[PDB]
């Protein structure tokens, strides 16, 4: 979400989809959650490195 | 070919994609090939397989 300034003088709220895991935030998604979000995409594909 | 009639189905062909390298999974297709006979159950529960 996001204020809109453009009409007239005052605002109102709008919003754009993050469209990925990714776009949310490190306090809601912090870097050590990410890593074993991507250990767990390892374990199930079982792909080699 | 019509895959429901050879001795290789199609979930033979989806071990193969999902494997490690590994030496063990050399000697997991050969034990694949246990045939699922009535007296082919006689060798592997003599031999406590």
């Given amino acids: 979400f996001f204020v809109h300034p453009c009409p007239g003088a005052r605002g109102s709220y709008r919003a754009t989809h993050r469209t990925m895991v990714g776009n949310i935030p490190q306090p809601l998604a912090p870097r050590e959650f990410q890593e074993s979000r991507g250990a767990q995409f390892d374990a199930v594909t079982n792909m080699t490195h | ?49």
């Fill in chain 2, 1 to 49: 070919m019509a895959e429901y009639e050879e001795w290789h189905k199609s979930p033979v062909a989806a071990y193969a994609a999902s494997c490690q390298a590994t030496p063990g999974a050399i000697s997991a297709m050969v034990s694949m090939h246990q045939k699922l006979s009535a007296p082919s159950f006689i060798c592997q529960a003599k031999h406590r397989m």
